[model samples]
Target: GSSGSSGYLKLVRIYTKPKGQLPDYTSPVVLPYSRTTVEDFCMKIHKNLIKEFKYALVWGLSVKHNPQKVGKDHTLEDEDVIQIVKKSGPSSG
Candidate 1:
């Protein structure tokens, strides 16, 4: 075995798109083992995306329950599916 750093890469797939009722199996994001948080995922996509980041809908082996709502700091696992929903306009009066 070769000696390298402890950091390894993980693959996270994004399977939600507008107007598409089905999951998108084409898009996949690469992540580091050490930094596998929702915010990290957002950052990987785009720096601005993280600003509008409200929360994430996750469905995978990482959570005890399927389709759990998690914040940015929430850690994720490989092959995990995520939907990064942004903040909506004000509704309350």
Candidate 2:
């Protein structure tokens, strides 16, 4: 039985790419593997603009082979970069 650490806590580098804006990354933020959602990393930290992005695209560890473009249920690892792309609105007319 060599089951190592099950700790979900990890440090991640999240970046916000709002709509037409470029990727904005600050210092790597601390998070957990179980909390590896786009909204978790993006909206979790910055709730002021939660309703900004429609979804997120991740890059780096924990994303496995493909990328996640939905909820924050994905797995997250240390130094993982979380991308949030803003959609602006749902057609305000």
Candidate 3:
């Protein structure tokens, strides 16, 4: 019997602080080209992180494809560079 192999597809690459002078984020945060969104990105960091998400700093291409600024819930596109800024600390709950 021959069966197709199931595996993971490589997506985005993340660079962090101690290693690269950038902030610490989950390594290799996967953002499938078709499913890249701010909300999704937040979820990738942590489910609770999304709740504290205030806004994001996007850099690349045009404003439409890559706006200089974006809200917490902004839907993302392919190759859309982003930096999510959230409120201080974790929630009490």
Candidate 4:
């Protein structure tokens, strides 16, 4: 998606855990966006997984004061970043 292109977009802040943080846990606290949703960025790694996606936790900037939960159908606006949560699948062990 970061193909040097311009279109409907959101500015999500991806936070990285601070140094000396626990590996099993996380110190990175993403403002405006949650860590859970940030993990969904992996979907772009694979094309087949696109359609199998789920919903995302969106913070609407268009709306003032309160943030809202948006479904997949919601259209993104400029400077509006969100945490995307995708559907989980069975793991092959």
Candidate 5:
């Protein structure tokens, strides 16, 4: 009953800050099952994000271990939580 008709859509949360900062639960990102990956999430927010991305901190059923560290290719699932970790350094001017 959650979804309108087809369950093709997935609900994923985007945590803006790093660990221990607490999540902003106000809005959840909607994604298609086929495009539910760390890289996909990054691109959804902004194209440039993925370029500076290093890895992601994931939590929920998608990961074997809660709060597991994963690369861009890792698949996400419904209600899964994600936090982006960008490389430490200034971008070239």
Candidate 6:
């Protein structure tokens, strides 16, 4: 399943919350290129936990506004830095 020829192609760095007990990292960790929007990526990162999924909040070059909601179906070009924020509850109480 793993292809070596797929070496380091289309990889980008994202600063995301630790996916569990993973250490807090600061360096630009490389990730395989996936959906540019947070919505689709959630299905990927949170696949088994899909039912719990609502959507993802994003912030980056693609988002023109200050940390705006550019959800599903949107695309981004290279050099776009995105942050996939998992929203489990309402931002407000």
Q: Pick the candidate with the highest TM-score.
A: 5
Q: Mind giving the per-residue lDDT tens digits that candidate 2 earns over 1-93?
A: 675767545555555545465656664566665565555665566776556656566676656664667554555555555566557546766
Q: What is the per-residue lDDT of model 6 for residues 1-93, given as tens digits with 9 covering 90 to 100?
A: 767675556865555444353333465345466545444445556675335444443446666674555555655444444455445665655
Each prediction's RMSD to truth: 4.4, 5.5, 5.9, 9.5, 4.8, 6.7
Q: Write the per-residue lDDT of candidate 3 for residues 1-93, one digit (tens) a residue.
A: 475554454365432122225644455465765465677777776888777777776655526554466775565654445666656775666
Which residue pairs of candidate 3 clash?
A: none
Q: Which is the better candidate, 3 or 4, if ranked by TM-score?
A: 3
Shift in Å, residue 86, candidate 1 = 0.9
Using all chains and alpha carbons, the TM-scores for the candidates as numbered come to 0.72, 0.51, 0.56, 0.37, 0.74, 0.46
Q: Which stretches of candidate 3 lie over 4 Å from their true place?
A: 1-27, 62-67, 88-93
Query: lDDT value for candidate 6?
Result: 0.50
- Sorted on TM-score, best first, the list reads 5, 1, 3, 2, 6, 4
Candidate 2, superposed: residue stretches over 4 Å from native? 1-26, 32-36, 66-68, 88-93
Go through the candidates in order and give each one's C-alpha lDDT: 0.72, 0.59, 0.58, 0.42, 0.74, 0.50
Clashing pairs in 2: 37-72
* TM-score, cand. 6: 0.46
Query: What is the TM-score (0 to 1) of candidate 3?
Result: 0.56
Off by over 4 Å in 5: 1-21
- The ten-residue window of minimal lDDT in model 2 covers 8-17
What value does the lDDT take at residue 4 in candidate 5? 67
Best by lDDT: 5
